[PDB]
Short mmCIF file of N, CA, C and O in Angstrom, two decimals:
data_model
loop_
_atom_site.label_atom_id
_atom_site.label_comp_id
_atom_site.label_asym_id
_atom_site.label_seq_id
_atom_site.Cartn_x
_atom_site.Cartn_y
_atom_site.Cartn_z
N UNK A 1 -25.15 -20.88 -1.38
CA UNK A 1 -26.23 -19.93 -1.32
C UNK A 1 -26.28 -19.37 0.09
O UNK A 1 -27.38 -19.44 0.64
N UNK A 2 -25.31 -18.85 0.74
CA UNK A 2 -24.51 -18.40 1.80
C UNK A 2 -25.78 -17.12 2.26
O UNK A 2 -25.59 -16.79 3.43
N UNK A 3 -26.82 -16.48 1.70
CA UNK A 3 -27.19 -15.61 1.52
C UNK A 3 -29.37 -15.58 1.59
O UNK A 3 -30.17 -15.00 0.84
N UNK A 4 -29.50 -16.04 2.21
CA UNK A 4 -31.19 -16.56 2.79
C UNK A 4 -31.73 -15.35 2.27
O UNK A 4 -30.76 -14.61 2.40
N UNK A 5 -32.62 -14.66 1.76
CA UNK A 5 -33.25 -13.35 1.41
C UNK A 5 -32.75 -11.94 1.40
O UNK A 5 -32.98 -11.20 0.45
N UNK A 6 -32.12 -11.58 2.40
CA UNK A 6 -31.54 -10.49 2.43
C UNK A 6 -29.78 -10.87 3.58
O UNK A 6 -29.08 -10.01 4.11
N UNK A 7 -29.58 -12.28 3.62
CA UNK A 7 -28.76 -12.45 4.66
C UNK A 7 -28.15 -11.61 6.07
O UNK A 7 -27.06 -11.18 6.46
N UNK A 8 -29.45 -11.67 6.54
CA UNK A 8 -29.46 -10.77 8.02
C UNK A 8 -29.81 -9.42 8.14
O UNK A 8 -30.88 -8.90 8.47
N UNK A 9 -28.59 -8.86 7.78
CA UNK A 9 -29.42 -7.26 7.75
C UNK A 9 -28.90 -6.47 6.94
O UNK A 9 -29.56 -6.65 5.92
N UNK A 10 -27.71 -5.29 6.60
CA UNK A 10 -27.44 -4.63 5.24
C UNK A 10 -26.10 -5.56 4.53
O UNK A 10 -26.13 -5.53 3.30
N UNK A 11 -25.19 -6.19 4.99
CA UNK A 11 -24.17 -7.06 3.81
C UNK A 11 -23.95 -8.14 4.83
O UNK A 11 -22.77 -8.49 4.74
N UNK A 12 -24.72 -8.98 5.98
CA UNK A 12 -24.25 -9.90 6.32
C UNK A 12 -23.55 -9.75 7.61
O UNK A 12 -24.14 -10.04 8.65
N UNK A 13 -22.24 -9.30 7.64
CA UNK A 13 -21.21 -9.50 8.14
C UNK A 13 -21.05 -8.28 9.05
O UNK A 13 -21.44 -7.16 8.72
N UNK A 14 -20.39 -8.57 10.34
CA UNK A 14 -20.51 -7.34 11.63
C UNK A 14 -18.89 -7.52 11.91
O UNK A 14 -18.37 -8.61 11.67
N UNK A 15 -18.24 -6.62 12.34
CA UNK A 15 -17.07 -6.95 13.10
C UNK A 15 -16.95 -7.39 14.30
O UNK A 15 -17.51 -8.48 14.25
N UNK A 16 -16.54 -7.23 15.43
CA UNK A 16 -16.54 -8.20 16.62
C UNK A 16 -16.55 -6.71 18.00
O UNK A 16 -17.24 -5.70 17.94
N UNK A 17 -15.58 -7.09 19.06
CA UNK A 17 -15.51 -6.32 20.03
C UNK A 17 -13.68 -5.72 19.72
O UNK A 17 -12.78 -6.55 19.70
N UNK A 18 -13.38 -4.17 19.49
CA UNK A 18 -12.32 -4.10 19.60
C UNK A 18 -11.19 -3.14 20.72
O UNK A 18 -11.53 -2.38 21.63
N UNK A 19 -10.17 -3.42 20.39
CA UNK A 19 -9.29 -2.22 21.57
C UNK A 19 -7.92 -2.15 20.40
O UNK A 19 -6.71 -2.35 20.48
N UNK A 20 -9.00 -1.68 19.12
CA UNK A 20 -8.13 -1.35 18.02
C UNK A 20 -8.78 -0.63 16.69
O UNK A 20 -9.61 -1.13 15.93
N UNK A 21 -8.34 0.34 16.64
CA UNK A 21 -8.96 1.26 15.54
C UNK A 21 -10.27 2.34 16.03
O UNK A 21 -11.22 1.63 16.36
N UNK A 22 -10.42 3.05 16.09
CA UNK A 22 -11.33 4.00 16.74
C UNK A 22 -10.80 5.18 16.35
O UNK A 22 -9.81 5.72 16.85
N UNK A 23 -12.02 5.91 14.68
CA UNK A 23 -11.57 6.81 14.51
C UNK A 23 -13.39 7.98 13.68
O UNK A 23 -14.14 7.79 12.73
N UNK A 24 -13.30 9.01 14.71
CA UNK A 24 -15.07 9.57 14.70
C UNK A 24 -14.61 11.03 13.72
O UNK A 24 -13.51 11.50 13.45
N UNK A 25 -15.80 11.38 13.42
CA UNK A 25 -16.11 12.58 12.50
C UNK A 25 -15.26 13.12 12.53
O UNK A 25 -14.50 12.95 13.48
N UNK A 26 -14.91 14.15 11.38
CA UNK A 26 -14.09 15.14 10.48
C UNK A 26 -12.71 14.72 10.46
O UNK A 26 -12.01 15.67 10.09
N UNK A 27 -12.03 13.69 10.71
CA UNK A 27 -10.97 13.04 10.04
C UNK A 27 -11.31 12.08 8.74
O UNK A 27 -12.39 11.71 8.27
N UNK A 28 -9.83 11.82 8.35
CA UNK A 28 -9.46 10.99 7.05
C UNK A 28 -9.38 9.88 7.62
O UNK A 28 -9.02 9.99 8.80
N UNK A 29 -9.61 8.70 7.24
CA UNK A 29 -9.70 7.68 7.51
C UNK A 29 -9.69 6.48 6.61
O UNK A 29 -10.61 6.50 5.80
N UNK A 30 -8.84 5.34 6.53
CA UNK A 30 -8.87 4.33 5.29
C UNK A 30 -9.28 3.16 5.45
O UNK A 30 -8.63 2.33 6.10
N UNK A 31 -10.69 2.86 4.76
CA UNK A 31 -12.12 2.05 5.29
C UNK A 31 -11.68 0.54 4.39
O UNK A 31 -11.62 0.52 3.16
N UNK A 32 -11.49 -0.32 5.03
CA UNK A 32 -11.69 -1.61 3.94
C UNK A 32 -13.40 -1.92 4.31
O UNK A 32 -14.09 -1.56 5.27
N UNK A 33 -13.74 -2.78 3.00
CA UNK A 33 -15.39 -2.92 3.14
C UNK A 33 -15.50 -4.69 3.35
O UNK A 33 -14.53 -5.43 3.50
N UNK A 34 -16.33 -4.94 3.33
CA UNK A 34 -16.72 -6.66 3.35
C UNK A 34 -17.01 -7.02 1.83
O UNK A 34 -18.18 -6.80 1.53
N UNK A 35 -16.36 -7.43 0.99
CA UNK A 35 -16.52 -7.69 -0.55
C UNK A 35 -15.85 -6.83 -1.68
O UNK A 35 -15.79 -7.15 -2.87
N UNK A 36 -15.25 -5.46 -1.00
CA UNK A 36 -14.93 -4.56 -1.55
C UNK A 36 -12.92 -4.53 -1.47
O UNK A 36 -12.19 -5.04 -0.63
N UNK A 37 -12.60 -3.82 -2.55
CA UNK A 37 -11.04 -3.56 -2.27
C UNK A 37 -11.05 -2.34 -1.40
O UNK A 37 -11.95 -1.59 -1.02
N UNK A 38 -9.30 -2.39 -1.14
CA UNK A 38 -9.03 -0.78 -0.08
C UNK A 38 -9.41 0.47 -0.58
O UNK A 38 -9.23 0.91 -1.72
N UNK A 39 -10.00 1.02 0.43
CA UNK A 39 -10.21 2.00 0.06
C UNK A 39 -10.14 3.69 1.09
O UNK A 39 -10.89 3.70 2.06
N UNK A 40 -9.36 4.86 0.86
CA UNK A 40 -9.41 6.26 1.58
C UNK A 40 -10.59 7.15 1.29
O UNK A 40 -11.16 7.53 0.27
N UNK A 41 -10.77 7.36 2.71
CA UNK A 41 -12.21 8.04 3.28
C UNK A 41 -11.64 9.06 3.78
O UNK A 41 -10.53 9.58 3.64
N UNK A 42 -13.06 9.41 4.73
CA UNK A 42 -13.33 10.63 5.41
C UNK A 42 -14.16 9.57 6.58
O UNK A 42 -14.41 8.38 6.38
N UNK A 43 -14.48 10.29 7.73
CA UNK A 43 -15.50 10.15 8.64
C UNK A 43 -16.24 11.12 8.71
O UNK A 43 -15.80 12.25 8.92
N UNK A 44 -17.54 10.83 8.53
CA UNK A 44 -18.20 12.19 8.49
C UNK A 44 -19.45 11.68 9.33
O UNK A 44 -19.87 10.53 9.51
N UNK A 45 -20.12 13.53 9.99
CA UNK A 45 -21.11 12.49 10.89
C UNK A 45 -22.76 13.52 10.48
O UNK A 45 -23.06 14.69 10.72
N UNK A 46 -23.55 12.31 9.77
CA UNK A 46 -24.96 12.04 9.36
C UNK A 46 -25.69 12.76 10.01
O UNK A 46 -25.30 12.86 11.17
N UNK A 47 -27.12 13.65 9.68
CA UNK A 47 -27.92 14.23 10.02
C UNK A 47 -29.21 13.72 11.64
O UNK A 47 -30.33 14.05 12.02
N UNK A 48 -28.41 13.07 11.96
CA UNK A 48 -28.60 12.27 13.49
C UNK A 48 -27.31 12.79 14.24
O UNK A 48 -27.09 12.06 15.21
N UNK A 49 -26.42 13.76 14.13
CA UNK A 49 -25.07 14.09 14.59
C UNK A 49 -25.10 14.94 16.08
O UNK A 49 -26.10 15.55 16.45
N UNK A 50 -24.06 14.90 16.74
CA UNK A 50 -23.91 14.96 18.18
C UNK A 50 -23.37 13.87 18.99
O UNK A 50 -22.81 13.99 20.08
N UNK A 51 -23.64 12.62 18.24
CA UNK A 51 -23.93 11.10 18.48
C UNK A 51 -23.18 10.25 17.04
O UNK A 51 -23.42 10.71 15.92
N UNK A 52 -22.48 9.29 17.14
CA UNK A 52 -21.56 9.05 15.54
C UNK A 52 -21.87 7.16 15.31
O UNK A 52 -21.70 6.40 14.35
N UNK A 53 -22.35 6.99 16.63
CA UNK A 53 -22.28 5.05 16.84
C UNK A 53 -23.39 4.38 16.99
O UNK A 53 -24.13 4.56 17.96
N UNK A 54 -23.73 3.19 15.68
CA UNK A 54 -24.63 2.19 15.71
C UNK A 54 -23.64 1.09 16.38
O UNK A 54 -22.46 0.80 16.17
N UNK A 55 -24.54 0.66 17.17
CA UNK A 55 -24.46 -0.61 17.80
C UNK A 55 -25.32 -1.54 18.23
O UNK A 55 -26.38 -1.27 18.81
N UNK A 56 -24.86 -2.84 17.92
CA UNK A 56 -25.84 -3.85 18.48
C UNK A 56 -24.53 -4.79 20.03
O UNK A 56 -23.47 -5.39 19.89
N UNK A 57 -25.29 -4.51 21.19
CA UNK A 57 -24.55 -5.28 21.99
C UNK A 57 -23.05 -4.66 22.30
O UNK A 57 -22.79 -3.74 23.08
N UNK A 58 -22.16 -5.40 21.51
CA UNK A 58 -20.89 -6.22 22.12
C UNK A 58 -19.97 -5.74 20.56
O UNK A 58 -18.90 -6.30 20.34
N UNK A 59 -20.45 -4.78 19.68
CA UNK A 59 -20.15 -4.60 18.33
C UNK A 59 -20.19 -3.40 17.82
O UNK A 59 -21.33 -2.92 17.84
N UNK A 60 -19.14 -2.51 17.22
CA UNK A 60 -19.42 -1.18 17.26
C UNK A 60 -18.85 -0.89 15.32
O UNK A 60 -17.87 -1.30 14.69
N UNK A 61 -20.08 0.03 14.92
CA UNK A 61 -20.18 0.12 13.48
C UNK A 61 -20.31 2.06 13.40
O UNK A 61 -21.35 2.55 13.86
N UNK A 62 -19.37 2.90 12.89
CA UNK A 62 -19.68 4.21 12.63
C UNK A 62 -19.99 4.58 11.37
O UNK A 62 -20.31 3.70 10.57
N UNK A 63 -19.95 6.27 10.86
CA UNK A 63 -20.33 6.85 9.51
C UNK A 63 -19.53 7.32 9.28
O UNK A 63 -19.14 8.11 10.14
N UNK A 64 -18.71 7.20 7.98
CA UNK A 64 -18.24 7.62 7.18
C UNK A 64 -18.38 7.78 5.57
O UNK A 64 -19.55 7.68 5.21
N UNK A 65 -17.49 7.99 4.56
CA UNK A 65 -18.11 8.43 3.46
C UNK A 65 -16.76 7.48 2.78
O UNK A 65 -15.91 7.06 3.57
N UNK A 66 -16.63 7.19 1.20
CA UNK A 66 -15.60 6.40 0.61
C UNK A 66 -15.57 7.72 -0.33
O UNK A 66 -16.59 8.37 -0.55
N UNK A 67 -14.18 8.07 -0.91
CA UNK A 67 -14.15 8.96 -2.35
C UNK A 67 -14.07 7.97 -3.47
O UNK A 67 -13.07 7.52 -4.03
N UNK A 68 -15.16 7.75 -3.66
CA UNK A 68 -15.50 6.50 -5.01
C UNK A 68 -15.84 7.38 -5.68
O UNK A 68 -15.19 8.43 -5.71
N UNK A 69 -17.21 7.16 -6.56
CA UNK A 69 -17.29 8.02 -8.01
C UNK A 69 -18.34 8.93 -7.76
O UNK A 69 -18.66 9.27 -8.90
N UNK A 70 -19.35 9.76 -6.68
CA UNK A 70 -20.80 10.47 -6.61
C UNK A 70 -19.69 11.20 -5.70
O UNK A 70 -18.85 11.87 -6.30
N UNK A 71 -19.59 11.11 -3.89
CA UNK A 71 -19.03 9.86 -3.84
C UNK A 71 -20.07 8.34 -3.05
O UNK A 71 -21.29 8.43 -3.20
N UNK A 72 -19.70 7.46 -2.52
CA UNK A 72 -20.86 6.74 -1.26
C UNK A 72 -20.53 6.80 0.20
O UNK A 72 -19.50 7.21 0.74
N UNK A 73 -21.49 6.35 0.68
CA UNK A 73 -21.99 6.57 2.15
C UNK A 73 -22.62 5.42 3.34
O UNK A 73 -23.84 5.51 3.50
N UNK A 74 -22.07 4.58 3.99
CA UNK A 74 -23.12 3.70 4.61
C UNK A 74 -22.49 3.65 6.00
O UNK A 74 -21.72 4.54 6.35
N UNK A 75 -22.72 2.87 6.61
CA UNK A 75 -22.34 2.69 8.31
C UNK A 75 -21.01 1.60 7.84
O UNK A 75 -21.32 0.76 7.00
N UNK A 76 -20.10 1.58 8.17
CA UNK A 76 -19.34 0.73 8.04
C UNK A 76 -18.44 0.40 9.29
O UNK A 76 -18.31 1.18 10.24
N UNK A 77 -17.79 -0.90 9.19
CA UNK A 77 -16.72 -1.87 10.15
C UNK A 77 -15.85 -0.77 11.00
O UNK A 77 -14.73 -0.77 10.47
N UNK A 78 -15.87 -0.02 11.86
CA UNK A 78 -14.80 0.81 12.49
C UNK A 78 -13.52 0.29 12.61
O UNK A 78 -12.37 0.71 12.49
N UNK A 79 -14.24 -1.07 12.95
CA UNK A 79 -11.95 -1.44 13.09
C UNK A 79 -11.54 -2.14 12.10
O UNK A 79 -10.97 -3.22 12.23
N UNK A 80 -11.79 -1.59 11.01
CA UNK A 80 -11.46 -1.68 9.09
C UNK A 80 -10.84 -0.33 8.92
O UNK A 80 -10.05 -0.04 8.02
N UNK A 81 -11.30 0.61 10.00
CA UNK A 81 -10.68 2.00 9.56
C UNK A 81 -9.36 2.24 9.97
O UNK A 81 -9.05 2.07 11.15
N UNK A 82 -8.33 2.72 8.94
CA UNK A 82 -6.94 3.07 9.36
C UNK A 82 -6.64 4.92 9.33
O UNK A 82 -6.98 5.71 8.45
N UNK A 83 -6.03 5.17 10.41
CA UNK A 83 -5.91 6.82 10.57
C UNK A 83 -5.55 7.75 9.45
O UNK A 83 -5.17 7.17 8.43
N UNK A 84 -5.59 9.15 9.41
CA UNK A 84 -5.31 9.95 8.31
C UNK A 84 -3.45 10.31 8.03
O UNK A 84 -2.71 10.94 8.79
N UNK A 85 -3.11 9.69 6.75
CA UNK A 85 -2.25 9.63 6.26
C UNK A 85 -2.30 9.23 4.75
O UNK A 85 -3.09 8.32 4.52
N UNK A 86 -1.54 9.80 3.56
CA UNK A 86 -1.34 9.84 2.77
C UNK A 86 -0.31 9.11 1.95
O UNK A 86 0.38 8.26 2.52
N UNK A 87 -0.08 9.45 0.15
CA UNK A 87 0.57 8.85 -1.16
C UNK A 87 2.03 8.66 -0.52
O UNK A 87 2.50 7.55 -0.76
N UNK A 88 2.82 9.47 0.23
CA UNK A 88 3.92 9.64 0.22
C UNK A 88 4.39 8.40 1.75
O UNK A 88 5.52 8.57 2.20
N UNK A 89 3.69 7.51 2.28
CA UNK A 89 3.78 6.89 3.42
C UNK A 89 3.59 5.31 3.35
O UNK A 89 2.49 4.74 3.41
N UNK A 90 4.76 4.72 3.23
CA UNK A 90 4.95 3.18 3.29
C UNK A 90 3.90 2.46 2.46
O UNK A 90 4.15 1.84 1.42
N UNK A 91 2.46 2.63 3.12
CA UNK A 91 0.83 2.06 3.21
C UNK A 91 0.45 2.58 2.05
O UNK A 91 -0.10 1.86 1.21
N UNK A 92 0.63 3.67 1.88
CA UNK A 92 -0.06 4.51 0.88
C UNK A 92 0.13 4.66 -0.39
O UNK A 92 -0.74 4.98 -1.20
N UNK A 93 1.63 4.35 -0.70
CA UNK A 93 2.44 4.39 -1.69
C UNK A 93 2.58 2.95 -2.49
O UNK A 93 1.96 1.92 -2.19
N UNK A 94 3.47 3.10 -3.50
CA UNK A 94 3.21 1.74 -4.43
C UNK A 94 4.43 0.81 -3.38
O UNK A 94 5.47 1.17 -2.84
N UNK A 95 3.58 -0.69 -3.44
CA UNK A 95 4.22 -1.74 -2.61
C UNK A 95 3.56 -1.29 -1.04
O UNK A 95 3.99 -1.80 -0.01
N UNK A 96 2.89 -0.64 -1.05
CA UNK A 96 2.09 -0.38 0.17
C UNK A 96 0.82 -1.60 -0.01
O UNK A 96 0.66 -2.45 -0.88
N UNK A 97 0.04 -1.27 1.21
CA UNK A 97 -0.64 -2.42 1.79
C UNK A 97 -2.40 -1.59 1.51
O UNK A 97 -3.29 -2.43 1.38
N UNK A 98 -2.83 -0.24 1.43
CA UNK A 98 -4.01 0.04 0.75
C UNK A 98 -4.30 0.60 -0.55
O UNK A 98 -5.31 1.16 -0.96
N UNK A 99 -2.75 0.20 -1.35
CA UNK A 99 -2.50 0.79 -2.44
C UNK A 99 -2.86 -0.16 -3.84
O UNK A 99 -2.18 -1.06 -4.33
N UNK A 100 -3.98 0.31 -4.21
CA UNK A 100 -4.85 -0.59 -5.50
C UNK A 100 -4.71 0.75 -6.21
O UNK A 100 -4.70 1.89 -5.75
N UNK A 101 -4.57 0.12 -7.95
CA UNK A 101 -4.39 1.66 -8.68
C UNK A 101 -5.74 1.26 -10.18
O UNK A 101 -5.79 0.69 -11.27
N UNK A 102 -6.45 1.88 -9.38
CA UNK A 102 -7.86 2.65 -9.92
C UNK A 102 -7.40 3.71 -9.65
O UNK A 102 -6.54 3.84 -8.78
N UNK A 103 -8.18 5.29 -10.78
CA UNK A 103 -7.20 6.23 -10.83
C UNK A 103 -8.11 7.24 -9.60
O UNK A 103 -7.63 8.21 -9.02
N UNK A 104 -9.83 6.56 -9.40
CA UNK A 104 -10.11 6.95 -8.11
C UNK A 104 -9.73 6.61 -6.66
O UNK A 104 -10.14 7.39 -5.81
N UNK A 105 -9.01 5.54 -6.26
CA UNK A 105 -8.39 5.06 -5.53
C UNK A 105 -7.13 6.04 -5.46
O UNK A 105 -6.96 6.53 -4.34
N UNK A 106 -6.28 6.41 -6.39
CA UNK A 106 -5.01 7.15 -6.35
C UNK A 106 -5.64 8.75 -6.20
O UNK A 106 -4.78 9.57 -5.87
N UNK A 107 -6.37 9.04 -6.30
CA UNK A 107 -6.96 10.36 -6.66
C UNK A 107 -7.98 10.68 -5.14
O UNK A 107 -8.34 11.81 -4.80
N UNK A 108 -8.21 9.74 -4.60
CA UNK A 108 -8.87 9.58 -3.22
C UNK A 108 -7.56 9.53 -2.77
O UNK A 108 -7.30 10.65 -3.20
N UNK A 109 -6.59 9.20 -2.31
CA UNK A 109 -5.26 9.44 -1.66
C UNK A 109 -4.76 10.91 -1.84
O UNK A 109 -4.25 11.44 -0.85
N UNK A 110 -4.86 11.67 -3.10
CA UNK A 110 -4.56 12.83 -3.08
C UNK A 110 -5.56 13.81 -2.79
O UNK A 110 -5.05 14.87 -2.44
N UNK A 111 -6.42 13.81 -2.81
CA UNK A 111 -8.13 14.47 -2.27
C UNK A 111 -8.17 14.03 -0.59
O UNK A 111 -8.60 14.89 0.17
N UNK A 112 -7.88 13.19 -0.21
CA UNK A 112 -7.56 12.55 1.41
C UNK A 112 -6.32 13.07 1.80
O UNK A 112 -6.26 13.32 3.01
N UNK A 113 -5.05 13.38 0.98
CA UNK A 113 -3.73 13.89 1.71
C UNK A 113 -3.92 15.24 1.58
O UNK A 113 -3.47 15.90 2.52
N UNK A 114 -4.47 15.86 0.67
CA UNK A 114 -4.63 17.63 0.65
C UNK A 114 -5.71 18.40 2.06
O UNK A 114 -5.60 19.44 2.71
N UNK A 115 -6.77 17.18 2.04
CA UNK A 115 -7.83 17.64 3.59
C UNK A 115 -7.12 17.05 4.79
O UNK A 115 -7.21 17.67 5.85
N UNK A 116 -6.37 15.85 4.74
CA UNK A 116 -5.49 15.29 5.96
C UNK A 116 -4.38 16.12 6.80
O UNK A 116 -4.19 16.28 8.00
N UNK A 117 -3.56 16.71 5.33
CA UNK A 117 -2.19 17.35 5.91
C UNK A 117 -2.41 19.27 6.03
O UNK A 117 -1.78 20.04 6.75
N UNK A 118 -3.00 19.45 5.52
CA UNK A 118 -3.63 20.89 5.56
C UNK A 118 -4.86 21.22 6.83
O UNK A 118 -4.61 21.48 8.01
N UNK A 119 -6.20 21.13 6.19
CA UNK A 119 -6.91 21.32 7.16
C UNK A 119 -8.70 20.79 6.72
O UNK A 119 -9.03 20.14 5.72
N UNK A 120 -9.60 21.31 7.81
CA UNK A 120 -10.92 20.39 7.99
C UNK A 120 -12.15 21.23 6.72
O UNK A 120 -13.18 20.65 6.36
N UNK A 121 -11.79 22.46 6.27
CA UNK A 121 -12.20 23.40 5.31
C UNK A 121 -12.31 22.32 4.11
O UNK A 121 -13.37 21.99 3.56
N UNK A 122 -10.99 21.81 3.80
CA UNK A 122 -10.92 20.53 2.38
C UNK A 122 -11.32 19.72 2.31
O UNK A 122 -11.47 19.34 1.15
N UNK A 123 -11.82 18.83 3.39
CA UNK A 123 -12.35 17.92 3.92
C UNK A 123 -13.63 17.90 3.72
O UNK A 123 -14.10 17.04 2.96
N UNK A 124 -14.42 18.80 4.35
CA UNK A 124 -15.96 18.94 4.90
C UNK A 124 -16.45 19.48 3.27
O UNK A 124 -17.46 18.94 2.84
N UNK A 125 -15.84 20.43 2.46
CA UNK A 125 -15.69 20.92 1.70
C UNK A 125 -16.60 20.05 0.43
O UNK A 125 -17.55 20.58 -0.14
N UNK A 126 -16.03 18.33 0.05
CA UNK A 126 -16.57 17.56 -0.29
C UNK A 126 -17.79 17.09 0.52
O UNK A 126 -18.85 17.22 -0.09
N UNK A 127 -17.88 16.53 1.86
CA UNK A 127 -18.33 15.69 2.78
C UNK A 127 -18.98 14.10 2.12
O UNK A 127 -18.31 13.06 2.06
N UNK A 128 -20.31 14.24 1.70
CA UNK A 128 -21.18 14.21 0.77
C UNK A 128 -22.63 15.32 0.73
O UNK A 128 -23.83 15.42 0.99
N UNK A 129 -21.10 16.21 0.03
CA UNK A 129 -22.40 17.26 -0.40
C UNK A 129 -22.61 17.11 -2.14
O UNK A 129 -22.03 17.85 -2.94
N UNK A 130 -23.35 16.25 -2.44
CA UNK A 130 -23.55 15.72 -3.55
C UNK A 130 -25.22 17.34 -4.10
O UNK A 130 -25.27 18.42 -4.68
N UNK A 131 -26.27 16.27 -3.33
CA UNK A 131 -27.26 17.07 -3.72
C UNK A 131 -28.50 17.04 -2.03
O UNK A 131 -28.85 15.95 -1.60
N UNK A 132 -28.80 17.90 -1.57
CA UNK A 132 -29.56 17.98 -0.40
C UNK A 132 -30.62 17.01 -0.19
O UNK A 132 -31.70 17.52 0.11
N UNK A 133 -30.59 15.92 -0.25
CA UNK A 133 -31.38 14.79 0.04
C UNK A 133 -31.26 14.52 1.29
O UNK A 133 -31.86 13.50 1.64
N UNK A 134 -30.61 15.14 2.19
CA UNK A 134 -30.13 14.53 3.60
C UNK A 134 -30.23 12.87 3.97
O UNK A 134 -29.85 12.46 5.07
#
């Protein structure tokens, strides 16, 4: 029962101090989560923007977005994030290392390689512009 009421603050678990992975707004980016499989993003930066970083201390957490199914949105692990690259690249491809085949997972690789290898129009295009709730 690893998990006391709300276990600390939004899933528990923080990453540490790094001098690895550091990647801010309007790039592609490939987010692993704490409980979750791999998954290709975006970084996108939240209606507090100018500014992209929660931190407590000694620990650094940014905003980005996952192409899941609406799509979702929360502060997540920065040095979980891997740079913008696509289907056709070692990682990306089958026998690759963020390659799980859900057909949104494969379909977020091609929606992530069309705004990655082209331009920021395809990208922002989605963001999460779902519905104006800011």
């Amino acid at each position: 029962k690893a998990k006391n009421l709300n276990g600390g603050l939004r899933r528990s678990v923080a990453p540490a101090a790094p001098t690895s992975s550091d990647f801010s707004p309007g790039d592609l980016v490939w987010a692993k989560m704490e409980g979750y499989p791999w998954w290709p993003s975006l970084v996108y930066n939240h209606p507090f923007d100018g500014t992209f970083i929660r931190e407590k201390g000694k620990s650094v957490r940014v905003h980005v977005q996952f192409f899941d199914d609406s799509p979702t949105r929360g502060w997540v692990s920065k040095r979980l994030l891997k740079p913008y690259t696509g289907s056709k690249s070692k990682e990306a491809q089958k026998g690759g290392h963020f390659y799980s085949a859900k057909p949104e997972i494969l379909r977020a690789m091609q929606r992530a390689d069309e705004a990655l290898n082209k331009d920021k129009i395809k990208r922002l295009e989605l963001a999460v512009s779902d519905e104006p709730s800011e």
